[PDB]
Design a protein around this ligand. Structure first.
Ligand SMILES: CCCCCCCCCCCO[C@@H]1O[C@H](CO)[C@@H](O[C@H]2O[C@H](CO)[C@@H](O)[C@H](O)[C@H]2O)[C@H](O)[C@H]1O
Lengths: 100, 116
């Protein structure tokens, strides 16, 4: 991954940029314009982030299992060419935060 | 004001996120009405003979303490809903009462988890 060339872009909790079907009603359904808007790069799920967290810190966090995942879906994305797209990435609608 | 109790005598009782045990009023049908379940968890804990005190710890103050321990704000979470839990810090009368208090606390309606 490498810190030097990496930017993290967390997407808002109320946005589903990668599940095509969206069930607000009981049935099928914004989209990929998050994805390749940064292309002009890879997706990291909140559920993977949570497994990685337990892997790093030790066993489950038993007090949270019965409730929603508080982490954010994100997209993991030259050294001097960093601060730029960081600012750029906060522009996009739906994005919660970005980190450089 | 700060609470001060020994580890060997403490039980943490985590409150279900949909239970407002410490709110005297809630909104029902668009009006502010008294909360009929106010202090239901508190009262079940306080009424155990083996319990010395029961102190509310809000998720807001827990977050503040978390940043005071770990440093800085967790920037990317700020503005979003606090995922920590409201809790009661329970002080047992004696260390041998802790295991019984925990099990008994788990059964209370409105309790999400307990840590002994
Ligand atoms: C699964 C792993 C668990 C990770 C847990 C993450 C760490 C806790 C994150 C909590 C961040 O959530 C944040 O909480 C605090 C207090 O509740 C709130 O920020 C606060 O700032 C001002 C003052 O600075 C307070 O007066 C006010 O109570 C609140 O808005 C904020 O509204 C919320 O956005």
């Amino acid at each position: 991954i490498e810190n030097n060339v990496r930017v993290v872009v967390y997407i808002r909790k109320d946005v589903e940029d990668n599940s095509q079907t969206i069930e607000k009603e009981g049935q099928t359904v914004d989209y990929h314009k998050v994805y390749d808007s940064l292309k002009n790069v890879t997706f990291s799920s909140k559920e993977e982030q949570y497994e990685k967290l337990t892997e790093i810190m030790g066993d489950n966090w038993k007090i949270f299992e019965g409730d929603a995942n508080p982490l954010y879906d994100a997209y993991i994305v030259a050294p001097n060419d960093v601060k730029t797209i960081a600012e750029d990435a906060k522009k996009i609608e739906g994005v919660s935060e970005v980190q450089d």
